[PDB]
Design a protein around this nucleic acid. Structure first.
Ligand SMILES: [Mg+2]
Ligand SMILES: [Mg+2]
Ligand SMILES: [Mg+2]
Ligand SMILES: [Mg+2]
Ligand SMILES: [Mg+2]
Ligand SMILES: [Mg+2]
Ligand SMILES: [Mg+2]
Ligand SMILES: [Mg+2]
Ligand SMILES: [Mg+2]
Ligand SMILES: [Mg+2]
Ligand SMILES: [Mg+2]
Ligand SMILES: [Mg+2]
Ligand SMILES: [Mg+2]
Ligand SMILES: [Mg+2]
Ligand SMILES: [Mg+2]
Ligand SMILES: [Mg+2]
Ligand SMILES: [Mg+2]
Ligand SMILES: [Mg+2]
Ligand SMILES: [Mg+2]
Ligand SMILES: [Mg+2]
Ligand SMILES: [Mg+2]
Ligand SMILES: [Mg+2]
Ligand SMILES: [Mg+2]
Ligand SMILES: [Mg+2]
Ligand SMILES: [Mg+2]
Ligand SMILES: [Mg+2]
Ligand SMILES: [Mg+2]
Ligand SMILES: [Mg+2]
Ligand SMILES: [Mg+2]
Ligand SMILES: [Mg+2]
Ligand SMILES: [Mg+2]
Ligand SMILES: [Mg+2]
Ligand SMILES: [Mg+2]
Ligand SMILES: [Mg+2]
Lengths: 146, 179, 129, 176
RNA sequence: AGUAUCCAAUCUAGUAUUGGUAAUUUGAGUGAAGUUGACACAAGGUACUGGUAGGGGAACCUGUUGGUGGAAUA
RNA sequence: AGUCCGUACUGUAAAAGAUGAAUACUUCAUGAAUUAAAUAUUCAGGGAUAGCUAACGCAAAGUAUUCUACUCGGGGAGUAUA
RNA sequence: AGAAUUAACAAAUGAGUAAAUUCUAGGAGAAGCUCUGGCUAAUACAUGUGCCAGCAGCCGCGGUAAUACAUGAGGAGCAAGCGUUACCCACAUUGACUGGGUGUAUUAAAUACAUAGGUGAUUACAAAUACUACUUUAAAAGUCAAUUAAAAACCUAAUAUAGU
RNA sequence: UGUUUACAGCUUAAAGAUUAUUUUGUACAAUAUUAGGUAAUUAUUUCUAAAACUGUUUAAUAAUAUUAUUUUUAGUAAAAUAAGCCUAGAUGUUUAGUUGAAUUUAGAGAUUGUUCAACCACAUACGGGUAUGAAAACUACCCUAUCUUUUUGACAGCAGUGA
């Protein structure tokens, strides 16, 4: 057989969590593989995040040794400078313009923000960025001493 | 005891090993009568006895002796041949020879007195003990093993184990258990 | 052990005829009475059974009053009654041909009594909470 | 003592040689030689792990090995290695003797009209057997011959013993 | 193409081996306040009992060897 | 009859020290025996104790090491069947 | 309980669905089941019954004085489960490597030689191994002590094997 | 006898990846109320058949004058010689899908081998057999046999029905 790169599932019901595998085309896609290469995790959490993982050191083996991705993987590997992007259905050089992109959901990230003091938060940021400048201008008098 | 049994187990149909070559017993019996007719007792020589009279010689002569004394000559007669160093008494080559001279007697004792059950158990030990020293001597001085078996009319049958467990058994090889 | 062909064969089973199963159905041939041993004295009812596997059997009747006759389909529990010999099994109530014990409103689970319509005050949330 | 023995597997023990695993290469002892052509039986010992008793176990096993020169005898301790099967029950050959065992050569060096008797006795039974009982089983083909010749030879020796009798009974009658 | 060889299913017979069923017969355990007698645990009223042989309404009795899981005798 | 002897079978028991085989070390008394200026120790249960043991009890059934075997409640039962 | 909106699995196309967000009402709007002699937390309360009727997981209750049956009250516990049965594991040194016992507790077979196998004296020397640290292989899923006190997750350790 | 660097499609050879098949060691349940089993059986040599043929020189081999020799698979519907092989629970009977691993557990272990996944096996029948292909019989095809309805068919594919 020929070697193929394609996806393989590990996520559960209404919670997909795919993998990336180098396996031939004749065996069960839910079966065995020769080298686990990467992940594809679309969901978020407080711990896990939305990822595209790959191991360049081995994608450059099988491609250099005989292999061929699928459509999705061809997209994901475009961003690692290993392959090009797959082509759109109707085709590039014909896309019409659309309105601007806007962020719908901020994903439930909780970086350091203070609660129950909404009115005075603008005061908090001055006091935090003024101290940037002070240590800068005041780190000089050490460098003279050294 | 030791039988022809190539597997680990020891069956009923398997036959015991051969103590002697064909017609080994009778040849040895002939050798004794030649000694018995022309020899004196173990400690004494003919040279020491030539001044003394015949009545002194016939007493010391080995015709009139007991079988317990007839061996003592034959043993020392062997020690001068099959020794490693002077005043050797216990080395392997001699120890086999001692049992061969006993088997000549035990068989005569057992063919005749068949009901001496304690003797029937004693043969099985002599043969087994002979069968050990007969093997340990192959392993150490093989060119003395053959110089014995000719004299005492013994077959040259190697052990079925192949001297595996005494000699240079080491580093016994590696394998793995699973399931 | 021969009737048992799983697990620890060295263990003597606690219900041999009934075997590996948890329950088994049968049909009555005849009812009986059996005396207990000497320290006690009573007339404890008993109910024969032929099982679907064609095996004779005896069984216990816990309820005070009972509907039992010949040609009655019954279901076995496997537990037993103690004082009696050969009665190491026991029947189950609230099933094919027994009857819920009557004029009874306590321990309504062993004997098959459903809940009365007075004590219950609300319906299940699948319909009209 | 010496200095140059320090890698000889005898003084070294059997440790120095580095054997491949999984029964590729092995260490053992010969049991038979000369009973068949270019074959020798060999014994080996294994040692694997057994966790329930937390101690290694042992296992003896017997193999049959291909010797090209018919060179080895029993006590010769020897390395053997895996080969594809040229025959059944032979997937091993010899690589090297580790420790020798002395030979029986010095003692071996010291160690016709029947051919018309023999060749008849063969043709006797093949004429009889083939008519009576056919090829059907090799056991019959062999158990007969080995058991029939001794029945034949002591009768065929008797055919030639008559020759010494007939020639002289003429001379006894022709002379006197 | 086709002749001739090799071979399978099904069927026939008996044999070997293992299971199912039965006239009839027999054994064991268990339950209960039964009858007959009194074997056993004390020296159980003749010390018990093992192996064996014979005898025998039953429990048991006797010979022959062994053992203490029996007392007793100064 | 048998009991005794000869030839051969039979192959069981409370077959016993009811205690698997071997090695090394270990208490006090009482006592048995060599007989030692070649050579120096061996043994016993009819006593007790350390230690071990459920207790009675054992100088091994004690302390330490090596190998083998049996043991999965009782009746049924050392019986049925082959 | 009710109603509404969105993200993402396709920056062309969604079957179906957020362990996401907001709004209104109103203010626990979801409780049963077993037990009441001891093991076992809970009554020397009341009535009738009288080795009968019946309970019983084990011991065992009931013979006119029943905290054990049946009636009633009170009281205890578990909880979207409670209880019963059947099988398996642990608790158990209840099958003994860790970790037993074998004189008397239904356990050393009558006994010895002996094969396979197991096992094992001194010093000196080599070699290798164990132990320590690192590293190879042993599919993923699953398990696993994941760590900067963090859920919807991807502990790399153990054990075994080769090797430095 | 338009162009095969215009696109698609096909053929042939090589290099390599992967895959299929072939090989070994150890592990792998009870039972002796089963102990002899195997008979082209065990080993070597030979013969036959298929693998492209012939020569030149060189190397190497045994003797040594220098000539001759140099390989692999299969077949007992090829033969001969010698007699061995397994029995270190062979053979035989019974039971059973193996494993990762699941339940439990302080840990070792014990019991099970469901879900998913790997490998093997079956597809009415412990059945016989073929074509194509790199690899097959699973809804392929032929035959026999069993059962059943149409000369089809066998739901251990999903859903569903009966028992
Ligand atoms: Mg009948
Ligand atoms: Mg009496
Ligand atoms: Mg009496
Ligand atoms: Mg009587
Ligand atoms: Mg008594
Ligand atoms: Mg005694
Ligand atoms: Mg005795
Ligand atoms: Mg005993
Ligand atoms: Mg102790
Ligand atoms: Mg004890
Ligand atoms: Mg004492
Ligand atoms: Mg003593
Ligand atoms: Mg003891
Ligand atoms: Mg029993
Ligand atoms: Mg008994
Ligand atoms: Mg008996
Ligand atoms: Mg019997
Ligand atoms: Mg019969
Ligand atoms: Mg979208
Ligand atoms: Mg509100
Ligand atoms: Mg209480
Ligand atoms: Mg009252
Ligand atoms: Mg345990
Ligand atoms: Mg004993
Ligand atoms: Mg013994
Ligand atoms: Mg040995
Ligand atoms: Mg894994
Ligand atoms: Mg564990
Ligand atoms: Mg399965
Ligand atoms: Mg299923
Ligand atoms: Mg499925
Ligand atoms: Mg079907
Ligand atoms: Mg398939
Ligand atoms: Mg279906």
């Amino acid at each position: 057989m020929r070697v193929v790169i394609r996806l393989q599932q590990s996520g559960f019901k209404n919670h997909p969590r795919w993998k990336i595998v180098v396996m031939p085309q004749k065996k069960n896609p839910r079966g065995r593989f020769l080298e686990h290469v990467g992940w594809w995790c679309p969901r978020q959490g407080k711990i896990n995040q939305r990822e595209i993982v790959v191991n360049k050191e081995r994608v450059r083996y099988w491609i250099a040794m005989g292999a061929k991705p699928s459509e999705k993987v061809q997209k994901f590997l475009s961003y690692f400078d290993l392959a090009p992007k797959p082509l759109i259905k109707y085709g590039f050089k014909t896309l019409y313009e659309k309105p601007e992109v806007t962020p719908k959901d901020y994903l439930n990230l909780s970086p350091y923000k203070i609660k129950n003091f909404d009115n005075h938060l603008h005061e908090f940021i001055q006091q935090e960025e003024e101290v940037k400048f002070l240590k800068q201008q005041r780190m000089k008098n050490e460098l003279i001493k050294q | 005891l030791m039988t022809m049994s190539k597997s680990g187990r020891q069956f009923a149909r398997d036959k015991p090993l051969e103590e002697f070559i064909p017609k080994g017993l009778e040849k040895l019996k002939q050798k004794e009568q030649v000694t018995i007719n022309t020899n004196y007792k173990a400690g004494f020589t003919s040279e020491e006895l030539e001044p003394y009279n015949e009545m002194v010689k016939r007493a010391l002569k080995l015709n009139n002796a007991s079988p317990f004394e007839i061996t003592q000559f034959k043993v020392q007669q062997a020690i001068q041949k099959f020794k490693v160093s002077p005043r050797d008494t216990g080395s392997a080559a001699i120890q086999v020879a001692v049992r061969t001279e006993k088997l000549i007697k035990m068989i005569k004792h057992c063919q005749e007195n068949r009901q001496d059950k304690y003797a029937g158990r004693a043969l099985v030990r002599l043969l087994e003990q002979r069968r050990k020293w007969l093997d340990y001597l192959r392993f150490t001085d093989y060119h003395r093993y053959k110089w014995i078996c000719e004299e005492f009319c013994i077959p040259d049958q190697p052990p079925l184990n192949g001297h595996h467990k005494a000699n240079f058994r080491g580093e016994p090889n590696r394998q793995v258990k699973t399931i | 052990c021969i009737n048992k062909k799983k697990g620890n064969l060295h263990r003597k089973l606690r219900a041999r005829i009934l075997g590996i199963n948890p329950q088994k159905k049968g049909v009555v041939m005849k009812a009986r009475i059996v005396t207990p041993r000497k320290p006690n004295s009573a007339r404890r009812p008993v109910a024969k059974v032929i099982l679907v596997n064609k095996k004779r059997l005896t069984a216990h009747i816990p309820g005070i009053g009972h509907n039992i006759r010949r040609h009655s389909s019954v279901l076995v529990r496997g537990g037993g009654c103690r004082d009696l010999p050969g009665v190491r099994y026991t029947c189950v109530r609230g099933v094919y041909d027994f009857s819920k014990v009557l004029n009874r409103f306590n321990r309504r689970s062993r004997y098959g009594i459903p809940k009365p319509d007075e004590e219950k005050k609300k319906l299940r949330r699948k319909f009209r909470v | 003592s010496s200095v140059w023995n320090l890698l000889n597997p005898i003084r070294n023990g059997a440790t120095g040689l580095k054997l491949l695993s999984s029964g590729r290469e092995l260490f053992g002892t010969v049991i038979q030689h000369g009973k068949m052509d270019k074959t020798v039986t060999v014994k080996v010992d294994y040692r694997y792990w057994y966790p329930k008793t937390k101690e290694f176990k042992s296992k003896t096993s017997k193999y049959q090995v291909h010797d090209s020169e018919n060179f080895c005898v029993t006590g010769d301790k020897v390395v053997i290695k895996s080969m594809l099967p040229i025959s059944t029950m032979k997937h091993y050959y010899v690589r090297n003797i580790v420790k020798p065992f002395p030979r029986d050569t010095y003692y071996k060096e010291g160690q016709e009209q029947l051919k018309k008797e023999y060749q008849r006795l063969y043709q006797e039974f093949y004429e009889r057997e083939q008519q009576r009982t056919e090829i059907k089983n090799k056991k019959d083909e062999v158990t007969l011959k080995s058991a029939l010749k001794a029945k034949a030879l002591t009768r065929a020796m008797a055919n030639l013993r008559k020759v010494e009798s007939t020639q002289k009974k003429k001379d006894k009658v022709v002379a006197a």
